[PDB]
Amino acid sequence: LQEMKDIGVQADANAEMRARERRDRLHEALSVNRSRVNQLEKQIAFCEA
């Protein structure tokens, strides 16, 4: 229990599930946005060529 107080994270079960869900959807959103950025950049490069 002292180690638990040391780590200092509430880590509630409901909080755990919610947090993992939100951060994972953030991860996928980031990846998709980066892919969109790459696609648009390639389109612009094609336009220049």
Side-chain angles (χ1 to χ4, degrees), residues 11-28:
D12 284 27
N14 184 89
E16 189 276 331
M17 64 184 73
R18 266 61 164 167
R20 67 185 297 269
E21 299 149 16
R22 277 85 60 84
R23 305 304 180 89
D24 295 342
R25 55 90 179 174
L26 293 168
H27 280 283
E28 57 79 17

Side-chain angles (χ1 to χ4, degrees), residues 14-44:
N14 184 89
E16 189 276 331
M17 64 184 73
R18 266 61 164 167
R20 67 185 297 269
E21 299 149 16
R22 277 85 60 84
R23 305 304 180 89
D24 295 342
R25 55 90 179 174
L26 293 168
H27 280 283
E28 57 79 17
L30 172 154
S31 69
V32 172
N33 308 341
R34 180 265 303 153
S35 73
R36 298 165 188 162
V37 162
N38 290 340
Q39 182 61 256
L40 304 164
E41 292 155 342
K42 294 293 102 182
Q43 296 162 349
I44 280 167

Side-chain angles (χ1 to χ4, degrees), residues 1-11:
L1 187 56
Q2 165 47 37
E3 191 73 8
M4 281 305 188
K5 308 301 183 181
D6 167 46
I7 185 165
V9 63
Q10 54 92 47

